[PDB]
Amino acid sequence: SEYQTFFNPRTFGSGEADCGLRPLFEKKSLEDKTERELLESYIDG
């Protein structure tokens, strides 16, 4: 998960390193009921 750190923990506090990874889903390799709906819409060109 190549995430680029942007804030300074001294002023931001803890949490940025593991941001956006949900304990009950991504952390356990489980998908919620409708996220596939989102991912399938990110096509491009």
Binding site: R10, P23, K33
Partner: protein, 259 residues
């Protein structure tokens, strides 16, 4: 949230409830970005015409919740505010441009399976995902409809609501209303002929519009529920504060008041 569904437990662990102390009432949504910083909409904190001109001491935030009213023992956490920061260019007298604000918690919140921060977008994630047709997700405890009959009808959800919605082309957003739209705003929702529907509504402001990066599997907050004309109206769309475009302000406030 209109035409949405009940959220799964822990589906949106960065969800935050903005509460007024006296009288005790739910004001807006917000989002957790760190153990001590919370993001929300400016008009939720300052809009004199609609009884809103709060100070750090008039408010409280509840984190890790699911039920709108039920106290969830040893799961939800309540935090007081140390300081509120409103965008300097936000001017309620003219419009809702730059509808963004930051709230610093008196003390850091502890993370759990139900409390976790969301990420803020970098420029490549922003360029990659902010495209018409791409779907984002909006969550909140706001109203389920524009109006209802008090007590007999039901306009307030029992638990957190969620709805996935597609980003709409700017020209389409602009032609949908006479209200002046700025680059600090983006809109989303289904088109009238799509048949599918959904939208945010009163009480959802300050809540996040998120997207999941297909590049690193992380959830990013691209927008903040800001305003709309009615709720879930054909030919109308919900408007959101453009988070990436105001990221420089977020940065400035933080290494200047974070400690």
């Amino acid at each position: 949230i209109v035409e949405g569904s009940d959220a799964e437990i822990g589906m949106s662990p960065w969800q935050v409830m903005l509460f007024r102390k006296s009288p005790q009432e739910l004001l807006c949504g917000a989002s957790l970005i760190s153990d001590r910083w919370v993001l929300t909409a400016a008009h939720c904190l300052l809009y004199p015409p609609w009884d809103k001109n709060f100070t750090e001491n008039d408010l409280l935030v509840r984190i890790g919740k699911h039920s709108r009213t039920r106290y969830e023992r040893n799961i939800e956490k309540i935090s007081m505010l140390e300081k509120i920061y409103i965008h300097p260019r936000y001017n309620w007298r003219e419009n809702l441009d730059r509808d963004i604000a930051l709230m610093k918690l008196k003390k850091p919140v502890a993370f759990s399976d139900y409390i976790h921060p969301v990420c803020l977008p970098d420029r490549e994630t922003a360029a990659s995902l902010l495209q018409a047709g791409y779907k984002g997700r909006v969550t909140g405890w706001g109203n389920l409809k524009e109006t209802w009959t008090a007590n007999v009808g039901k306009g307030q959800p029992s638990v957190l609501q969620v709805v996935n919605l597609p980003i709409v082309e700017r020209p389409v957003c602009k032609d949908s209303t006479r209200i002046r739209i700025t680059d600090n705003m983006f809109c989303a929702g289904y088109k009238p002929d799509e048949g599918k529907r959904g939208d945010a509504c009163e009480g959802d402001a300050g809540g996040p519009f998120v997207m999941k990066s297909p590049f690193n599997n992380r959830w990013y907050q691209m927008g903040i529920v800001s305003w709309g004309e009615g709720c879930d109206r054909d030919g109308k769309y919900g408007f959101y504060t453009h988070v990436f475009r105001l990221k420089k302000w977020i940065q400035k406030v933080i290494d200047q008041f974070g400690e």
